[PDB]
Design a binder for these strands. Structure first.
Ligand SMILES: C[S@@+](CC[C@H](N)C(=O)[O-])C[C@H]1O[C@@H](n2cnc3c(N)ncnc32)[C@H](O)[C@@H]1O
Ligand code: NA
Length: 376
DNA sequence: CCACATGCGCTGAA
DNA sequence: GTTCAGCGCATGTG
């Protein structure tokens, strides 16, 4: 009766998709398997392996000779020199493990019908809004489209991914992007998929974070007919509220910010349940100038900048949300954070960067809970 | 025009 | 090349 769910995570990061599936697997009678993944960012790969591996023992290794397209900052490729610096280190063993055990193909431009796994149950992905335009698609989405085009011609219909799931930022549905987004949906139709777009806020899925994200869930149209799957109305879901205080970790050795030079005001709560107050003459950057009340929800955690530096008011003073608390804020577990910390390879700021790039795990749990698979 | 809200950001000096 | 402190406006609603 157990159903093996083969998942392929494009732009996998630390694997919020895989985590959500593992979290619900027992309740669905599923066994989750790594079909493959695509992630080039060294710190994300290391962290993914730390979080998701079982019985991996890191050791000094030569980097596999075809691991050539990777990135230390997530944006730009590492040089020949930088590859040399990873070669013959413990870090190399993480990258080798991701390749061998998780079938990480690293770079989407290197994925094609000759290495894209057949019979995928769930394919996850994303793309920046620029990719909708010429510079017709471009960039990462063009590669995803190329891959779907390629496998459409070489695979049987039944070998194509059963479900696709895109995550993206809210601005995907802006005036400038919405029509071109709709043409991507038309293209998915041409590839044989029926889709539904959801705009979901983490705060409605048992989280203390305001975070609005766009999801496009697609089902292969013959599999829709076979299963009798119907899309659920997830935008109407409103679970009980959670407050920032519910995730905070007690410590006697936090660093508190000296805000004595800055004038401030009372807290005010907005319609989004964010409770905040401004610091006057602090910076000229509006999003940096707020302190958040722990009895409401907080702002969207970003990878960098002002919203990666979330100031909260506590009895003990004003401080930033810690890297551990940021993992919790994205609905990863304390043990996931400890595994990443224990690598001794990822800085505190890099741990927040990877958390800020992820997806709140319980949103994905709710989406994946709606999927239907046949007993055959 | 206004008030208000809100952000998986970006980058150049060291 | 890295790192992060310093820095503002795009894109809305009402
Ligand atoms: C917003 S994040 C995704 C985080 C992920 N959803 C998670 O569960 O943590 C986007 C990711 O795409 C990755 N990426 C960017 N360009 C890539 C490429 N050419 N190949 C593979 N991954 C890429 C980045 O390194 C980054 O980790
Ligand atoms: Na080396």
């Amino acid at each position: 009766k157990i159903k093996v769910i083969k998942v392929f995570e494009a732009f996998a990061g630390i694997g919020s998709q895989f985590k959500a599936l593992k979290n619900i697997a027992r309740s669905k009678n599923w066994e989750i398997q790594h079909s493959g993944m695509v992630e080039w960012f060294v710190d994300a790969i290391v962290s993914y392996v730390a979080i998701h591996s079982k019985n991996f023992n890191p050791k000094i290794e030569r980097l596999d000779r075809d691991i050539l397209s990777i990135s230390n900052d997530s944006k730009m490729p590492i040089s020949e020199y930088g590859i040399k610096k990873i070669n013959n280190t413990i870090k190399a063993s993480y990258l080798n493990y991701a390749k061998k055990h998780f079938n990480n193909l690293f770079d989407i431009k290197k994925v094609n019908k000759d290495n894209f796994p057949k019979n995928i149950d769930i394919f996850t992905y994303s793309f920046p809004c620029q990719d909708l335009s010429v510079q017709t698609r471009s960039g990462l989405l063009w590669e995803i489209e190329r891959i779907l085009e390629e496998i459409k011609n070489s695979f049987s219909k039944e070998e194509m991914p059963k479900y696709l799931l895109m995550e993206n930022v809210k601005n995907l549905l802006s005036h400038k992007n919405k029509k071109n987004y709709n043409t991507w949906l038309k293209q998915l139709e041409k590839f044989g998929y029926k889709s539904k777009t959801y705009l979901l806020n983490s705060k409605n899925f048992d989280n203390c974070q305001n975070r609005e994200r766009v999801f496009c869930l697609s089902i292969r149209d013959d599999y829709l007919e076979k299963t009798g799957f119907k899309f659920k109305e997830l935008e109407k879901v409103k679970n009980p509220p959670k407050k920032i205080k519910d995730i905070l970790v007690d410590s006697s050795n936090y660093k508190y910010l000296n805000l004595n030079k800055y004038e401030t005001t009372t807290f005010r709560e907005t319609k989004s349940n964010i409770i905040s107050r401004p610091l006057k003459n602090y910076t000229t950057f509006n999003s940096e100038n707020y302190v958040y009340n722990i009895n409401g929800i907080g702002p969207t955690l970003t990878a960098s900048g002002a919203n990666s530096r979330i100031k909260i008011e506590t009895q003990q003073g004003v401080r930033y949300l810690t890297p551990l608390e940021c993992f919790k804020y994205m609905q990863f577990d304390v043990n996931d954070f400890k595994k990443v910390q224990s690598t001794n390879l990822i800085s505190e700021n890099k741990m927040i960067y990877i958390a800020g790039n992820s997806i709140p795990v319980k949103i994905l749990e709710a989406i994946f809970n709606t999927l239907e698979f046949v007993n055959n």
